[PDB]
Amino acid sequence: MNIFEMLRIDEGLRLKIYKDTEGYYTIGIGHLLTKSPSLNAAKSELDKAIGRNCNGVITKDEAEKLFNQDVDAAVRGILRNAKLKPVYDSLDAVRRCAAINMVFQMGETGVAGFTNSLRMLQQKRWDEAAVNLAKSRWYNQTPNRAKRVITTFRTGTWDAYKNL
Ligand SMILES: CCCc1ccccc1
Secondary structure, eight states, X not given: OOHHHHHHXXXXXXXXXEEOTTSOEEEETTEEEXXXXXXXXXXXXXXXXXXXXXXXXXXXXXXXXXXXXXHHHHHHHHHHOTTHHHHHHHSOHHHHHXXXXXXXXXXXXXXXXXXXXXHHHHTTOHHHHHHHHHSSHHHHHSHHHHHHHHHHHHHSSOHHHHTO
16 A cells, blocks of 8 residues: 555545535545636636646546646645644654645645644554544544544554555
């Protein structure tokens, strides 16, 4: 398992514009297009992102290119953030994937506010971190995905993903 496989499981792959769990226009492997309720605005964002007139549909290659960019952006967001970088650098490789997954889903500023969990992770208090992480809108709104990511932080293994 690696971060691409993990997020491909969590986000799926859809080649036509769809609405994500929050009702926002998205495409590909969880590439958010816009939070605007306008499908036309989403199509404009899509065309800008891909560099051609897509009329709301892309190829698998194009989806994977956006996904490479989005993973890259999540990692860079972590490395540029003074609250996230030290915790990330303290983690092992599997747990770094759980970190990237959260930043991919919620964005860097969002995650950077998880202050108590960040501290417990930096301290390697894994069961405590897991308990704290579940006390969140995130866990309540996407509990199956949150449980996988939390298990990944708790154990430092891919046990929650290997069956998938
Ligand atoms: C709950 C914070 C998880 C995290 C995210 C980004 C970098 C390190 C740890």
